[PDB]
Structure formats: C-alpha cells, structure tokens
Amino acid sequence: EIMSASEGEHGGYKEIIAKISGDGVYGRLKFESGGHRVQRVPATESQGRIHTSACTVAVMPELPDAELPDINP
Amino acid sequence: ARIAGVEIPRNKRVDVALTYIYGIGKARAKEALEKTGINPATRVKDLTEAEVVRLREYVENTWKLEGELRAEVAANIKRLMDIGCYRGLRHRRGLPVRGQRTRTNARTRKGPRKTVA
Amino acid sequence: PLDLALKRKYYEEVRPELIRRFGYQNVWEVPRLEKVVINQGLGEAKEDARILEKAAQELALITGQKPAVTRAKKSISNFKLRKGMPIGLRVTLRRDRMWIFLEKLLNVALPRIRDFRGLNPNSFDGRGNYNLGLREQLIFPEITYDMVDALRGMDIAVVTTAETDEEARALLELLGFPFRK
Amino acid sequence: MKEGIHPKLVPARIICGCGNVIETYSTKPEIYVEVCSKCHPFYTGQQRFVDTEGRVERFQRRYGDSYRK
RNA sequence: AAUCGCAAAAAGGUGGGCCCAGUUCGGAUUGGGGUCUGCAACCCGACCCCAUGAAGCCGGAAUCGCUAGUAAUCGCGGAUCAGC
RNA sequence: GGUCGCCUCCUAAAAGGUAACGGAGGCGCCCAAAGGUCCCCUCAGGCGGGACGGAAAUCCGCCGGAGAGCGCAAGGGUAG
RNA sequence: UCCCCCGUGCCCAUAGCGGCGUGGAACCACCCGUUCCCAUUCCGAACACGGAAGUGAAACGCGCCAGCGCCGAUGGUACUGGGCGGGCGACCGCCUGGGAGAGUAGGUCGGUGCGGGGGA
RNA sequence: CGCGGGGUGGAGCAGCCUGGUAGCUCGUCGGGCUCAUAACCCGAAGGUCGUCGGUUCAAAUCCGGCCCCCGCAACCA
RNA sequence: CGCGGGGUGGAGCAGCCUGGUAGCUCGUCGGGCUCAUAACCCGAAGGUCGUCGGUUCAAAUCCGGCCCCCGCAACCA
Ligand SMILES: [Mg+2]
Ligand SMILES: [Mg+2]
Ligand SMILES: [Mg+2]
Ligand SMILES: [Mg+2]
Ligand SMILES: [Mg+2]
Ligand SMILES: [Mg+2]
Ligand SMILES: [Mg+2]
Ligand SMILES: [Mg+2]
Ligand SMILES: [Mg+2]
Ligand SMILES: [Mg+2]
Ligand SMILES: [Mg+2]
Ligand SMILES: [Mg+2]
Ligand SMILES: [Mg+2]
Ligand SMILES: [Mg+2]
Ligand SMILES: [Mg+2]
Ligand SMILES: [Mg+2]
Ligand SMILES: [Mg+2]
Ligand SMILES: [Mg+2]
Ligand SMILES: [Mg+2]
Ligand SMILES: [Mg+2]
Ligand SMILES: [Mg+2]
Ligand SMILES: [Mg+2]
Ligand SMILES: [Mg+2]
Ligand SMILES: [Mg+2]
Ligand SMILES: [Mg+2]
Ligand SMILES: [Mg+2]
Ligand SMILES: [Mg+2]
Ligand SMILES: [Mg+2]
Ligand SMILES: [Mg+2]
Ligand SMILES: [Mg+2]
Ligand SMILES: [Mg+2]
Ligand SMILES: [Mg+2]
Ligand SMILES: [Mg+2]
Ligand SMILES: [Mg+2]
Ligand SMILES: [Mg+2]
Ligand SMILES: [Mg+2]
Ligand SMILES: [Mg+2]
Ligand SMILES: [Mg+2]
Ligand SMILES: [Mg+2]
Ligand SMILES: [Mg+2]
Ligand SMILES: [Mg+2]
Ligand SMILES: [Mg+2]
Ligand SMILES: [Mg+2]
Ligand SMILES: [Mg+2]
Ligand SMILES: [Mg+2]
Ligand SMILES: [Mg+2]
Ligand SMILES: [Mg+2]
Ligand SMILES: [Mg+2]
Ligand SMILES: [Mg+2]
Ligand SMILES: [Zn+2]
Structure with missing residues (x-):
C-alpha cells in the first residue's frame, strides 16, 4: 500500500514510498537499498540515442515507535 | 388471464399473435395453424370462439410454454x-x-x- | 339462504366427511368459514389521485359489495406517507355473499392464474386461518381487458372455527383448495 | 346491507372453456372463462400435460451403445 | 473440362402479406436436439432445426473515405486449407 | 461572565412551606375544531399468516390493564 | 326457610390466568330469518327487528384441583418519637414507647345484599 | 392606524400613451459561424396579466373591494 | 477554564436562520486534440455532513454532552 507518491508527468512517480506488509519482507528486500542504473533508449527520446539514468531506492524495516507517556513529576 | 398462458395481441393477426407466447416462435406458429386448420392471416378477435377453443388446448398440451417452459x-x-x-x-x-x-x-x-x- | 353449489358441497358432503375423519360430539364443533376478507394494499395512490377509486369499482365488481377505505395508522417518512392519508381497501364477506366468492374463486379464478401449481400448504396460520396473495385482479371473469389500467393484487384472507391447521387443511382441501405437496 | 352503493347480484350463467355451464351468481350475467376446475392440470389429479419426465435427459438419453460385458 | 460440374448471382421485376409498435424492425444471448470434418470438437470449430429475441428509435468531444462508372450499395470467386 | 416573570420535577427531612451563582427541563403559544353534546369504538407492543411490501404501509388470527394516546415541558391523572 | 337459574349492587384478585368436568325442563346464550323499525366509514360481526328449527360447540353458570398470579402471619431485625452514654475525632452504643420492608409457616379457584323465575 | 404604487415567464421589465397593439435583454432550447470559452446571426418555447367582481362592442391600460412585497410620514400608554 | 465563531467528497467554501432538497471552484478518473506534455474540449466518479446522545413521521439543518480548531477576555490591588 503506497503512502507518499509524488507523480512524474510521464511516467513515474518521481518519488514514491510504500508500506509492504507481511512476513520475511525485510529479509528479501534488504539488499535493494542503493542506486539502480538503467541503460536504454528512453520514451522521451527526441531521436535515437540510448540514455543512462539512475534511481536510488531505500528499504527501511518496520520501526516499533513509542512517544514518552507525557511527562513525569 | 387468457389463451394460452396470457392474452395475445387482439389487434394484429393470429399467426403473429402466437409468437407473443413464451414458448412459440414463427415456426411453431405456422404449425399451430396447420394442425388446427385455422385461417392464417385473420385477426385475433375475428376468430370465432369455435376456432378459438380448438386452438386453445392444442398448444397448451403440445409443448412447454411460459413459466412451465421457463421452469x-x-x-x-x-x-x-x-x-x-x-x-x-x-x-x-x-x-x-x-x-x-x-x-x-x-x-x-x-x-x-x-x-x- | 340461497342455492349455492359450495354451500351445498359443504353441508351435503364436506361437513359429514369432517365428522368421519375427526368425529365430533356436537354439531357446532364442526369447522366452518365465517369471514372472507379481501385487502388490496394499494397505498401507491398515497398522496396521489383517487386512482384507487377505480380499484374500488373493480373490487366491488368481484364481491357484490362496496369496500370501505383504510387509512394510515402511524405516519412513515421512508414510505412518503403521512398518517391518516388513505392507503388501502378492505371488504369483508360474510354469509351468502362469501360463498358466492369462493364458489367463483375455487372454480373460475384460481386456475386462470399464471402457472398455477397449487396453494402453498405451509401458508397456514395456526389457530385455524388461511391466507394467500394475488398480484393480478383481472383473474376473475367479471374483470375484462379495458376495465384494467394496471395490475392490482390483493390479500385474500379466510377464517374458520377450526382449533388448528389440521381441521383447516382438511376443511379447505375438501372444499376445493388445491395444494402443492 | 347498506343498499345504495352496492352492485346487483344477478343470477349468472358462466360458459367455460370446456363447454361447462357453471351455475352460480355474479355481478356480470354472461361471463365466459378460459380454464376452470374441470380441466386444469393442478386441479384434477396429478394429470400429465406436455411434461412427462423432463426431455431425454440425462441417464436415459440412449441413442447409442457400445458395451456387451 | 470454352464439353461436365461448383452455380441459385444478389440487388432487380412481378405477386402477396406487414402498418410505425423494441414492431414480421434488430438477431445478440441462452436452453434443448442433431449434421459434417477429423484419432479426437471439454477448454476450442463451422453449419442445421426448435425455443429464447438482449443492447440498440441514428450515436458526446472528436474523426475517416472517396471527384466518375468513382463514392454508396448488391452479390460471386479465390489464395490458405481435413475442417473452420 | 451568568441570571431577572411564569410552568414541571427534585433538593424539601411522609400536612402546607422552605435557601443557595443547588440538580434537571419547559413557557411568552396553539385549536371554529383540538370546542358543546348525543352515540358508538379501545391502545402500544409481541408471535404466527399475508402479491408488489421492506424493521415498520394496509389485512387476518391469537396474545395484552395499560408500558399507547391525551397539540407542545414535566408531573399527576386517565380505557368503568 | 332449602337448592337451581335471571337481573343487580356491595367487598375490590383469598374473587384472576390456566387446566378439568358439568348444566338446557326453566333461564340465558349462541342460533333461525332480513319484510318492517334500526344498523355497517364494507360485512345483520356489531347494533336492530320478527322469531324458536337446532344446540350447549362457543359464551356464560356450576363445581374440581395450587403451575402462574394474588394473599401472607408468628418470631427477629432495619428504622425511629423521647431520654441518655463513650471516643480526640470519623461513628458506634444503652434505657423507654412505637415498628416495617424482604423472607419463612401458611392461605386462596370467592364472599355477599336486594329483587325476580323455578324447584321440595 | 393613516398615505404612496406594484407582481405581468424563471429573474430584471416599458407596455401603465390617451381602452382595440402582450415587448426588450439575459435565461433555456435547436441551427449558424467556431482552435476555442465567447461575442456574434436565424428560429423556438414561456405571460394565467395579484385576486374576486363591476363598466365597455373590446381593456395588463378604468373603477369597488381585497391578497401581498416594497416604498411614505407619524405614533408608541 | 469566561464569551463568540467553526468541523460537509482529497484541498478550500456554500447549504443550517426556515427540517424533507448535499452545491461551487480546484483536484482525481475515463475519452478527445497534439509528435508528445500542458492549456483546451467531452463524460464520470467521489462525502452518509467531528462525535456521542435526544426531538421528530423524517435531521447536514433543531436540542444537550464531549473532542478538535479559531478569535475575544483575563482588570483594581
Ligand atoms: Mg518530488
Ligand atoms: Mg517530499
Ligand atoms: Mg358435491
Ligand atoms: Mg375466532
Ligand atoms: Mg424487388
Ligand atoms: Mg445463436
Ligand atoms: Mg427514430
Ligand atoms: Mg452583566
Ligand atoms: Mg418528597
Ligand atoms: Mg431525605
Ligand atoms: Mg394553609
Ligand atoms: Mg392492535
Ligand atoms: Mg397489533
Ligand atoms: Mg409477519
Ligand atoms: Mg433493511
Ligand atoms: Mg392495572
Ligand atoms: Mg417540544
Ligand atoms: Mg404522565
Ligand atoms: Mg316467610
Ligand atoms: Mg386438573
Ligand atoms: Mg355436557
Ligand atoms: Mg360436555
Ligand atoms: Mg344429562
Ligand atoms: Mg333445549
Ligand atoms: Mg321443551
Ligand atoms: Mg355473538
Ligand atoms: Mg318452542
Ligand atoms: Mg329446543
Ligand atoms: Mg365436580
Ligand atoms: Mg413482626
Ligand atoms: Mg446510658
Ligand atoms: Mg481513648
Ligand atoms: Mg479526627
Ligand atoms: Mg473522627
Ligand atoms: Mg466513623
Ligand atoms: Mg462526623
Ligand atoms: Mg428499641
Ligand atoms: Mg390470607
Ligand atoms: Mg431568474
Ligand atoms: Mg355589457
Ligand atoms: Mg376586462
Ligand atoms: Mg427593500
Ligand atoms: Mg474541506
Ligand atoms: Mg496536448
Ligand atoms: Mg467507482
Ligand atoms: Mg469513497
Ligand atoms: Mg443524532
Ligand atoms: Mg437522529
Ligand atoms: Mg444542559
Ligand atoms: Zn372451464
């Protein structure tokens, strides 16, 4: 289920975050964190040239959070 | 209501009138005429009750019709x-x-x- | 009195047959009808024209007596209905006029309906009553084609002195009421 | 009887769709009928009508064999 | 096989019916019953008969073809191929 | 800031009455029928039955002493 | 005077619900008929009339049981008019006169007045 | 209470001259032209003229009464 | 806490005074235009109206309690 998701005119997603819920999820998506290069002739190509591009992705595990039960005398 | 399952269009002809029964098409319509010997192109109301009662039961008993067919x-x-x-x-x-x-x-x-x- | 085949069938056949089956020690203990109540629940002509006033004519045509009106008990918003506003017809058939109804209903009217498969036997009340429904009123022969402007059904309700459905089912089945199983 | 708004109850002859002369009373004197108690299927016994055993279906379809054992 | 056959061209003419209606318009969908080709038509064939007879009563923004035997309309033939 | 007259209940200690910036609600209208009288009728609700019809529209049955109704707040009264 | 029925009051369920049997000579009811009086927001159901063939089925009357309902002591307590007591205090306690509610035992399927009709 | 003048279709409205003529704009619909929204040009629908009632051959145009909104100036124990 | 206003489709704002009836702009979705994007053009979706209650035949509309937001007040010592 996606959360934040800024579009990208065409196509994208220029930025998009998503909560992938389940079991063994972080275990198999651990190694995705990093830069992913892409080489191809893009859709946007004004002629016929192959264009290199990149996208950083970041997998972050589920963080059990908890604010302090207010103050304490 | 009326013959056979419900009343048939008394305005137009009888060969057409039969079609408007959930069980009869133009085919069985022609047949209903022949195995009753009634005038093909005569309007419904114009049919004498003599003609009517004969054709009444003939088709009711021969095939499945209306809710019976639908069944x-x-x-x-x-x-x-x-x-x-x-x-x-x-x-x-x-x-x-x-x-x-x-x-x-x-x-x-x-x-x-x-x-x- | 009146020469009515049904009034006869009851007394000269059904009635003694009932005593044959269950055996009563008094002549009055033998079950018999008392009321036949018809109720077209129109209500469609609620805040609408007295289009029901034609349906009265249709109803009286069947019964041989004028039906009175029934009006709104409470008011209901969901039904587009204000209290007191008229919504239905009721006509009670006692004595001889009752018989003439059943004598015509059981004979002519009932089999003229769309795919008649016999009256539902489960539809029995409990303390000896039986109720059923009609969707079309042209079923009766007194009603013709142009006499009708729309299909108006009705809640036929027939009562009996019977203690239970056993006597009731028995009484009617001998009278001319078909059943499924 | 509150006579003054009720219809007449004339003696009615009723010729039905079987030659029947159903003797009774009615509001209409000469009314004719399509079907009555005397010939309806679900009225006079189990009857038959067209329906006998529901088509040739299905364990009795026949119209073929290839077994002798 | 200019011999024989596919082969009735269909619009057309004549005759008869239909009377402005979800219609004798429309033939989608479905039921039941069969024919053919193939080892074999469940997924997955084509055609025939019966019954079912849907949406659709001239189609928003938009858009296409074609200037003469053309456009529109009416059939027929073939390549493929057991079959469609 | 809140309140100011009138009504209902409680506070109020089993007559009447009784305070507080005590607890809770209403009123400033309405009806030519909602009034006078004679005559007849009896609820709400529950279960079972009932074409369209449902939680409930109108109909049947059985059950029911008042829990309905009595223009509107509440109390009292009220189907003899 | 004693029993039965009818009308009617009173007491206000110890009288009622439910179950069980019983009663038609009389009385009553249902019942029969819908011409007339009267009547239905439709129906002779109700109300009304003229009846008297049937019948105690229903209603009602009379008994019969205690499931429900209802009634419900004695004894004891709570509470309390009055009079005191103890404790720092919050609250307890004694004498005197009055005395529930609940619960237990148990009771109840009525009593009765006037009038009319009929019985011994 | 007393004076003043009005609804005319869906809103604004002369027709209220001087009684025989019910209009304009927008609105809405169809067509035109149109990159368009739009201006623009043709056609169409809707008026019972506040009510009952009176004069007239005929009156939304005149009167009697009255409904109603706005407008008028006083009064307010 | 003392008074006032407010919470309605993803954003912003009508509708509540007078009960029956969810509206505007933007956004989003589907189809056009263009080589493509935006503009533009055509069609659609999308809330049971903060929340518990009560009134009513019926509540976004009325009535009471709570939650959140906003402005005003908080003075003489
Ligand atoms: Mg971004
Ligand atoms: Mg960011
Ligand atoms: Mg017989
Ligand atoms: Mg009964
Ligand atoms: Mg031709
Ligand atoms: Mg097909
Ligand atoms: Mg057309
Ligand atoms: Mg002040
Ligand atoms: Mg008190
Ligand atoms: Mg006290
Ligand atoms: Mg005094
Ligand atoms: Mg009731
Ligand atoms: Mg009830
Ligand atoms: Mg029910
Ligand atoms: Mg529901
Ligand atoms: Mg009581
Ligand atoms: Mg109120
Ligand atoms: Mg009260
Ligand atoms: Mg004496
Ligand atoms: Mg017993
Ligand atoms: Mg006995
Ligand atoms: Mg007995
Ligand atoms: Mg005896
Ligand atoms: Mg006797
Ligand atoms: Mg005797
Ligand atoms: Mg009676
Ligand atoms: Mg006698
Ligand atoms: Mg006797
Ligand atoms: Mg005894
Ligand atoms: Mg005691
Ligand atoms: Mg002492
Ligand atoms: Mg001490
Ligand atoms: Mg202390
Ligand atoms: Mg102390
Ligand atoms: Mg203490
Ligand atoms: Mg103390
Ligand atoms: Mg004492
Ligand atoms: Mg006692
Ligand atoms: Mg306007
Ligand atoms: Mg004149
Ligand atoms: Mg005039
Ligand atoms: Mg103004
Ligand atoms: Mg918002
Ligand atoms: Mg573009
Ligand atoms: Mg959707
Ligand atoms: Mg949604
Ligand atoms: Mg609420
Ligand atoms: Mg509510
Ligand atoms: Mg309050
Ligand atoms: Zn017949």
Missing part, C-alpha cells in the same frame, strides 16, 4: 452449475458460455461497462 430452462442451468461443468462455471460467474472472446465485448453476459482506473 425447465431454469432447471437446466441449475444442474449444470451443480455438477461443476465448464458450461456451468461460466453460468456461475455470469460470463458467456458458448465459447466467445472475453478480452472484448461479451457485454450481454457482463451487463453495462464496469470501467475502473
């Missing part, structure tokens, strides 16, 4: 859907049975267009 048709789909044949699963999911292409059309089994993003 079997309904009963047919039941048994298909229960044994779980392919022709039954297609009824079960409300899709076209007689093997058509679903990627387009087949609207008449699907109803109106269920467009989503």
Whole structure:
C-alpha cells in the first residue's frame, strides 16, 4: 500500500514510498537499498540515442515507535 | 388471464399473435395453424370462439410454454452449475458460455461497462 | 339462504366427511368459514389521485359489495406517507355473499392464474386461518381487458372455527383448495 | 346491507372453456372463462400435460451403445 | 473440362402479406436436439432445426473515405486449407 | 461572565412551606375544531399468516390493564 | 326457610390466568330469518327487528384441583418519637414507647345484599 | 392606524400613451459561424396579466373591494 | 477554564436562520486534440455532513454532552 507518491508527468512517480506488509519482507528486500542504473533508449527520446539514468531506492524495516507517556513529576 | 398462458395481441393477426407466447416462435406458429386448420392471416378477435377453443388446448398440451417452459430452462442451468461443468462455471460467474472472446465485448453476459482506473 | 353449489358441497358432503375423519360430539364443533376478507394494499395512490377509486369499482365488481377505505395508522417518512392519508381497501364477506366468492374463486379464478401449481400448504396460520396473495385482479371473469389500467393484487384472507391447521387443511382441501405437496 | 352503493347480484350463467355451464351468481350475467376446475392440470389429479419426465435427459438419453460385458 | 460440374448471382421485376409498435424492425444471448470434418470438437470449430429475441428509435468531444462508372450499395470467386 | 416573570420535577427531612451563582427541563403559544353534546369504538407492543411490501404501509388470527394516546415541558391523572 | 337459574349492587384478585368436568325442563346464550323499525366509514360481526328449527360447540353458570398470579402471619431485625452514654475525632452504643420492608409457616379457584323465575 | 404604487415567464421589465397593439435583454432550447470559452446571426418555447367582481362592442391600460412585497410620514400608554 | 465563531467528497467554501432538497471552484478518473506534455474540449466518479446522545413521521439543518480548531477576555490591588 503506497503512502507518499509524488507523480512524474510521464511516467513515474518521481518519488514514491510504500508500506509492504507481511512476513520475511525485510529479509528479501534488504539488499535493494542503493542506486539502480538503467541503460536504454528512453520514451522521451527526441531521436535515437540510448540514455543512462539512475534511481536510488531505500528499504527501511518496520520501526516499533513509542512517544514518552507525557511527562513525569 | 387468457389463451394460452396470457392474452395475445387482439389487434394484429393470429399467426403473429402466437409468437407473443413464451414458448412459440414463427415456426411453431405456422404449425399451430396447420394442425388446427385455422385461417392464417385473420385477426385475433375475428376468430370465432369455435376456432378459438380448438386452438386453445392444442398448444397448451403440445409443448412447454411460459413459466412451465421457463421452469425447465431454469432447471437446466441449475444442474449444470451443480455438477461443476465448464458450461456451468461460466453460468456461475455470469460470463458467456458458448465459447466467445472475453478480452472484448461479451457485454450481454457482463451487463453495462464496469470501467475502473 | 340461497342455492349455492359450495354451500351445498359443504353441508351435503364436506361437513359429514369432517365428522368421519375427526368425529365430533356436537354439531357446532364442526369447522366452518365465517369471514372472507379481501385487502388490496394499494397505498401507491398515497398522496396521489383517487386512482384507487377505480380499484374500488373493480373490487366491488368481484364481491357484490362496496369496500370501505383504510387509512394510515402511524405516519412513515421512508414510505412518503403521512398518517391518516388513505392507503388501502378492505371488504369483508360474510354469509351468502362469501360463498358466492369462493364458489367463483375455487372454480373460475384460481386456475386462470399464471402457472398455477397449487396453494402453498405451509401458508397456514395456526389457530385455524388461511391466507394467500394475488398480484393480478383481472383473474376473475367479471374483470375484462379495458376495465384494467394496471395490475392490482390483493390479500385474500379466510377464517374458520377450526382449533388448528389440521381441521383447516382438511376443511379447505375438501372444499376445493388445491395444494402443492 | 347498506343498499345504495352496492352492485346487483344477478343470477349468472358462466360458459367455460370446456363447454361447462357453471351455475352460480355474479355481478356480470354472461361471463365466459378460459380454464376452470374441470380441466386444469393442478386441479384434477396429478394429470400429465406436455411434461412427462423432463426431455431425454440425462441417464436415459440412449441413442447409442457400445458395451456387451 | 470454352464439353461436365461448383452455380441459385444478389440487388432487380412481378405477386402477396406487414402498418410505425423494441414492431414480421434488430438477431445478440441462452436452453434443448442433431449434421459434417477429423484419432479426437471439454477448454476450442463451422453449419442445421426448435425455443429464447438482449443492447440498440441514428450515436458526446472528436474523426475517416472517396471527384466518375468513382463514392454508396448488391452479390460471386479465390489464395490458405481435413475442417473452420 | 451568568441570571431577572411564569410552568414541571427534585433538593424539601411522609400536612402546607422552605435557601443557595443547588440538580434537571419547559413557557411568552396553539385549536371554529383540538370546542358543546348525543352515540358508538379501545391502545402500544409481541408471535404466527399475508402479491408488489421492506424493521415498520394496509389485512387476518391469537396474545395484552395499560408500558399507547391525551397539540407542545414535566408531573399527576386517565380505557368503568 | 332449602337448592337451581335471571337481573343487580356491595367487598375490590383469598374473587384472576390456566387446566378439568358439568348444566338446557326453566333461564340465558349462541342460533333461525332480513319484510318492517334500526344498523355497517364494507360485512345483520356489531347494533336492530320478527322469531324458536337446532344446540350447549362457543359464551356464560356450576363445581374440581395450587403451575402462574394474588394473599401472607408468628418470631427477629432495619428504622425511629423521647431520654441518655463513650471516643480526640470519623461513628458506634444503652434505657423507654412505637415498628416495617424482604423472607419463612401458611392461605386462596370467592364472599355477599336486594329483587325476580323455578324447584321440595 | 393613516398615505404612496406594484407582481405581468424563471429573474430584471416599458407596455401603465390617451381602452382595440402582450415587448426588450439575459435565461433555456435547436441551427449558424467556431482552435476555442465567447461575442456574434436565424428560429423556438414561456405571460394565467395579484385576486374576486363591476363598466365597455373590446381593456395588463378604468373603477369597488381585497391578497401581498416594497416604498411614505407619524405614533408608541 | 469566561464569551463568540467553526468541523460537509482529497484541498478550500456554500447549504443550517426556515427540517424533507448535499452545491461551487480546484483536484482525481475515463475519452478527445497534439509528435508528445500542458492549456483546451467531452463524460464520470467521489462525502452518509467531528462525535456521542435526544426531538421528530423524517435531521447536514433543531436540542444537550464531549473532542478538535479559531478569535475575544483575563482588570483594581
Ligand atoms: Mg518530488
Ligand atoms: Mg517530499
Ligand atoms: Mg358435491
Ligand atoms: Mg375466532
Ligand atoms: Mg424487388
Ligand atoms: Mg445463436
Ligand atoms: Mg427514430
Ligand atoms: Mg452583566
Ligand atoms: Mg418528597
Ligand atoms: Mg431525605
Ligand atoms: Mg394553609
Ligand atoms: Mg392492535
Ligand atoms: Mg397489533
Ligand atoms: Mg409477519
Ligand atoms: Mg433493511
Ligand atoms: Mg392495572
Ligand atoms: Mg417540544
Ligand atoms: Mg404522565
Ligand atoms: Mg316467610
Ligand atoms: Mg386438573
Ligand atoms: Mg355436557
Ligand atoms: Mg360436555
Ligand atoms: Mg344429562
Ligand atoms: Mg333445549
Ligand atoms: Mg321443551
Ligand atoms: Mg355473538
Ligand atoms: Mg318452542
Ligand atoms: Mg329446543
Ligand atoms: Mg365436580
Ligand atoms: Mg413482626
Ligand atoms: Mg446510658
Ligand atoms: Mg481513648
Ligand atoms: Mg479526627
Ligand atoms: Mg473522627
Ligand atoms: Mg466513623
Ligand atoms: Mg462526623
Ligand atoms: Mg428499641
Ligand atoms: Mg390470607
Ligand atoms: Mg431568474
Ligand atoms: Mg355589457
Ligand atoms: Mg376586462
Ligand atoms: Mg427593500
Ligand atoms: Mg474541506
Ligand atoms: Mg496536448
Ligand atoms: Mg467507482
Ligand atoms: Mg469513497
Ligand atoms: Mg443524532
Ligand atoms: Mg437522529
Ligand atoms: Mg444542559
Ligand atoms: Zn372451464
């Protein structure tokens, strides 16, 4: 289920975050964190040239959070 | 109401009038005429009660008609859907049975267009 | 009194047959009808024209007596209905006029319906009453084609002195009431 | 009887769709009928009508054999 | 095989019916019953008979073809190929 | 800031009455029928039955002493 | 005077619900008929009239049981008019006169007045 | 209470001259032209003229009464 | 806490005074235009109106309690 998701005119997603819920999820998506290069002739190509591009992705595990039960005398 | 299952269009001819019975088409209409010997092109009301009562029972007893016919048709789909044949699963999911292409059309089994993003 | 085939069938056949089956020790203990009540629940002509005033004519045509009106008990918003506003017809048939109804109903009217498969036997009340429904009023022969402007059904209700459905089912089945099982 | 708004109850002859002369009373004097108690299927016994055993279906379809064992 | 056959061209003419209606318009969908080709038509064939007779009463924004035997309309033939 | 007259209940200690910036609600109208009288009728609710009809529209049955109704707040009264 | 029925009061369920049997000579009811008086927001159901063939089925009358309902002591307590007592205090306690509610035992399927009709 | 003048279709409205003529704009619909929204040009629908009632051959145009909104100036124990 | 206003489709704002009836702009979705994007053009979706209650035949509309937001007040010592 996606959360934040800024579009990208065409196509994208220029930025998009998503909560992938389940079991063994972080275990198999651990190694995705990093830069992913892409080489191809893009859709946007004004002629016929192959264009290199990149996208950083970041997998972050589920963080059990908890604010302090207010103050304490 | 009236012969046979319900009343038939008294304005137009009798060979047409029979069609408007859930059980009779133009085919069995012609036959109902011949195996009763009645005038083909004479209007409904114009038929003498003598002509009427003879044709009344003739067709009631020969084939299945109206809710009686409908009954079997309904009963047919039941048994298909229960044994779980392919022709039954297609009824079960409300899709076209007689093997058509679903990627387009087949609207008449699907109803109106269920467009989503 | 009156020469009525049904009034006869009851007394000269059904009635002694009832005593044959259950055996009563008094002549009055033998079950018999008392009321036959018809109720077209129109209500469609609620805040609408007295289009029901034609349906009165249709109803009286069948019974041989004028039906009175019934009006709204409480008011209901969901039904587009204000209290007191008229919504239905009731006509009670006692004595001889009752018989003439059943004598015509059981004979002519009932079999003239769309796919008659026999009256539902479960539809029995409990303390000896039986109720059923009609969707069409042209079923009766007194009603013709142009006399009708729309299909108006009715809640036929027939009562009896019977202690239970056993006597009731028995009484009617001998009279001319078909059943499914 | 509150006579003054009720219809007449004339003696009615009723010729039915079987030659029947159903003797009774009614509001209409000469009314004719399509079907009556005297010939309806679900009225006079189990009857038959067209329906006998539901088509040739299905364990009795016949119209073929290839077994002798 | 200019011999024989596919082969009735269909619009057309004549005759008869239909009377402005979801209609004798429309033939989708479905039931039941069969014919053919193939080892074999469940997924997955074509055609025939019966019954069912849907949406549709001239189509928003938009858009296409074609200037003469052309456009529109009416059939027929073939390549493929057991079959469609 | 809140309140100011009138009404209902409680506070109020079993007559009446009784305070507080005590607890809770209403009123400033309405009806030519909602009034006078004679005559007849009896609820709400519950279960079972009932074409469209549903939780409930109108109808049947059985059950029911008042829990309905009595223009509107509440109390009292009220189907003899 | 004693029993039965009818009308009617009183007491206000110890009288009622439910179950069980019983009563038609009389009385009553249902019942029969819908011409007339009268009547139905439709129906002779109700109300009304003229009856008297049937019948105690229903209603009602009379008994019969205690499931429900209802009634419900004695004894004891709570509470309390009055009079005191103890404790720092919050609250307890004694004498005197009055005395529930609940619960237990148990009771109840009525009593009765006037009038009319009929019985011994 | 007393004076002043009005509804005319869906809103604004002369027709209220001087009684025989019910209009304009927008609105809405169809067509035109149109990259368009739009201006623009043709056609169409809707008026019972606040009510009952009176004069007239005929009156939304005149009167009697009255409904109603706005407008008028006083009064307010 | 003392008074006032407010909470309605993803954003912003009508509708509540007078009960029956969810509206505007933007956004989003589907189809056009264009080589493509935006503009533009055509069609659609999308809330049971903060929340518990009560009034009513019926509540976004009326009435009471709570939650959140906003402005005003908080003075003489
Ligand atoms: Mg971004
Ligand atoms: Mg960011
Ligand atoms: Mg007989
Ligand atoms: Mg009864
Ligand atoms: Mg021709
Ligand atoms: Mg087909
Ligand atoms: Mg057309
Ligand atoms: Mg002040
Ligand atoms: Mg008190
Ligand atoms: Mg006290
Ligand atoms: Mg005093
Ligand atoms: Mg009731
Ligand atoms: Mg009830
Ligand atoms: Mg029910
Ligand atoms: Mg529901
Ligand atoms: Mg009581
Ligand atoms: Mg109130
Ligand atoms: Mg009270
Ligand atoms: Mg004496
Ligand atoms: Mg016993
Ligand atoms: Mg006895
Ligand atoms: Mg007995
Ligand atoms: Mg005896
Ligand atoms: Mg006797
Ligand atoms: Mg005697
Ligand atoms: Mg009685
Ligand atoms: Mg006698
Ligand atoms: Mg006797
Ligand atoms: Mg005894
Ligand atoms: Mg004691
Ligand atoms: Mg002491
Ligand atoms: Mg001490
Ligand atoms: Mg202390
Ligand atoms: Mg102390
Ligand atoms: Mg203490
Ligand atoms: Mg103290
Ligand atoms: Mg003491
Ligand atoms: Mg006692
Ligand atoms: Mg306007
Ligand atoms: Mg004149
Ligand atoms: Mg004039
Ligand atoms: Mg103004
Ligand atoms: Mg918002
Ligand atoms: Mg573009
Ligand atoms: Mg959707
Ligand atoms: Mg949604
Ligand atoms: Mg609420
Ligand atoms: Mg509410
Ligand atoms: Mg309050
Ligand atoms: Zn017949």
